[PDB]
């Protein structure tokens, strides 16, 4: 059950990650770091906020911020070296 | 010193099958690319005979 918790909360994060990737591919035409960092300073700010918000929800789940933390303490069911 | 379980042969049928197919595929890829560098075209392309577009 602890494993199911972790995988599902991080799939919630990954859903917002996929949303962000779709926005990024549509707006920038690419996923490469070079091009996105080349042209990001000219981009409309509402679009950048949409992209960054989706990416931050993903990172929030990964880094266990107070929105989506619950799996972090459940993960102590695994062996200690894990 | 921990106990010993029965001896098991390293190269099982699955090892031989999967390694053989994979390595043969890579060997075929390299042979085709070399045959292309020499002959001018991939050796696999020679078997391609579609009707002309016209």
């Amino acid at each position: 059950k602890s494993a199911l918790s972790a995988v599902l909360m991080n799939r919630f994060g990954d859903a917002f990650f996929v949303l962000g990737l779709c926005v990024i591919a549509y707006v920038f035409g690419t996923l490469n770091y070079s091009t996105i960092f080349a042209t990001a300073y000219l981009i409309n700010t509402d679009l950048l906020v949409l992209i960054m918000l989706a990416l931050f929800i993903a990172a929030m789940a990964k880094s266990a911020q107070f929105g989506l933390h619950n799996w972090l303490t459940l993960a102590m069911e695994g062996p200690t070296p894990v | 010193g921990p106990e010993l379980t029965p001896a098991v042969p390293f190269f099982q049928p699955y090892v031989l099958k999967w390694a053989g197919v994979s390595l043969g595929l890579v060997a075929f890829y390299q042979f085709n690319s070399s045959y292309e560098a020499k002959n001018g075209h991939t050796w696999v392309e020679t078997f391609f005979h579609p009707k002309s577009r016209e």
Partner: protein, 481 residues
């Protein structure tokens, strides 16, 4: 040849008494023949290539060499070649997955299975509305008989569902095809984008075509037949129904609807997006409260089909490519999951209730590993074709309508939920008390599963490998001024 090969069939039947080795050999030859056709297929051309006509008035029993075309037309382009390859990859596996569990009247069973496969393969060759419709319907009586005679306890209701629902949608498609026939006096797919009907008549013809699409895909809210039919079908029926037959609807959208009714399709796209979003969300949530393994697996297909619909109706090249890739990857992975639940577990225990299953990892570690792999493939883990299809479909959907595709992005989570909820209970915990230990997966079962996993992995790592057959297709159907 045909005379001699019929003699060969007859003698084999006389001596062996089981037709199945001959059918396996014939299907393997068919796959090799299709690969030879692919070798000789020209990719730098958007024209149909291996054309032939049947039942022309000048040669009713031969091929037509006449200046008047009144028979049924057949031929292939890249789009149809893709699905034909999927079909001929799948057919021998559907024969091999029932090699040992059919014992009474097995010759008829294998004949039905092979006939259904051949009908679908011919359906992908059809080049006009009438030939397409004929091969579209011809599977229904074969499926009715197969499910009625060789299905599980509730297979009578299931056979009646698989006949009646599909007939119901097909008859409205038939209304549309009749209207096209009498209004245009032509029915073929080669030049049907050259005919521009008035917008009003377009709007009317679209409705019949889309009702048939809604039942065959299926889409919400006319999906409820598919879990029953999948659950009660024998294994070959389920494999064909999930891997091939549902793909006919996506193919129908591309081949029958978009080239002819372009403007009406533009007008109707938001309604399609409503229906597909309802399909994805509601069927994904309904899966969470199912107690039959085969029903759960069947419900999964509906949500993936919704994602594919959203891609194929997105009016973008990425969306259409994603829809096709998703169709192929689902055709690999869903038959594997049906093999696990209705072929391996069901042949060992003869029961499908989820309460009975727990902790299979102890005695069957290999089956548990297969379950884990196929589960993460089914929920779109990257490097799997399922991820490529879903990701591209969602890109196209989001471009077509940012709000609707953005909300559609929740399918990642929802699919993860129902699938991993099943696999968590199947593999973890202490071995169940209700079942005795059985054999782990056999060599035949592993062979089938390995074929399907390697296929999905190959197109997951390099999806571009399909592009040489599809790059015309991703431009043939979008409507931009």
């Amino acid at each position: 040849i045909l005379l001699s090969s019929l003699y060969l069939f007859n003698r084999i039947l006389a001596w062996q008494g089981n037709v199945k080795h001959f059918y396996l050999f014939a299907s393997n030859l068919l796959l090799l023949f299709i690969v030879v056709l692919y070798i000789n297929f020209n990719t730098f051309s958007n024209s149909f290539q291996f054309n032939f006509e049947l039942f022309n008035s000048l040669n009713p029993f031969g091929l037509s060499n006449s200046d008047i075309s009144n028979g049924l037309l057949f031929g292939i382009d890249g789009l149809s070649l893709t699905f034909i390859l999927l079909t001929v990859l799948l057919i021998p596996l559907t024969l091999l997955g029932n090699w040992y569990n059919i014992n009474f009247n097995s010759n008829l069973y294998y004949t039905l299975v092979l006939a259904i496969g051949l009908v679908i393969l011919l359906n992908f060759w059809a080049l006009d509305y009438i030939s397409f419709y004929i091969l579209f319907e011809a599977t229904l009586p074969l499926l009715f008989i197969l499910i009625h005679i060789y299905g599980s306890s509730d297979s009578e209701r299931a056979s009646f569902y698989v006949l009646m629902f599909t007939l119901s949608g097909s008859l409205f498609m038939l209304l549309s095809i009749v209207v096209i026939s009498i209004v245009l006096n032509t029915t073929n797919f080669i030049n049907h984008n050259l005919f521009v009907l008035s917008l009003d008549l377009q709007t009317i013809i679209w409705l019949g075509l889309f009702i048939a699409i809604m039942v065959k895909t299926p889409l919400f809210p006319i999906h409820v037949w598919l879990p029953v039919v999948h659950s009660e079908s024998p294994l070959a029926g389920s494999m064909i129904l999930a891997g091939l037959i549902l793909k006919l609807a996506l193919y129908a959208i591309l081949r029958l609807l978009l080239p002819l009714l372009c403007e009406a399709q533009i007008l109707y796209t938001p309604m399609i997006y409503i229906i597909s979003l309802l399909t994805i969300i509601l069927t994904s949530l309904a899966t969470l409260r199912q107690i039959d393994l085969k029903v759960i697996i069947a419900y999964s297909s509906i949500s993936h089909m919704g994602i594919a619909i959203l891609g194929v109706c997105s009016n973008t090249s990425l969306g259409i490519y994603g829809s096709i890739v998703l169709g192929v990857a689902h055709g690999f992975v869903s038959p594997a999951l049906f093999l696990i639940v209705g072929g391996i577990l069901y042949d060992r225990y003869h029961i499908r209730i989820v309460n009975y299953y727990k902790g299979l990892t102890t005695y069957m570690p290999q089956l548990a590993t297969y379950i884990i792999i196929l589960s993460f493939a089914n929920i779109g883990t990257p490097l799997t074709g399922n991820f490529t299809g879903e990701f591209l479909s969602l890109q196209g959907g989001f471009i077509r309508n940012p709000i609707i595709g953005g909300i559609s992005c929740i399918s990642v989570l929802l699919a993860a939920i129902y699938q991993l909820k099943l696999t968590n209970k199947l593999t973890g915990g202490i071995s169940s008390i209700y079942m005795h230990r059985t054999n782990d997966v056999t060599i035949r079962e592993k062979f089938i599963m390995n074929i399907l996993i390697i296929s999905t992995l190959i197109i997951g790592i390099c999806p571009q490998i399909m592009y040489n057959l599809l790059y015309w297709t991703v431009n043939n159907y979008i409507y931009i001024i």
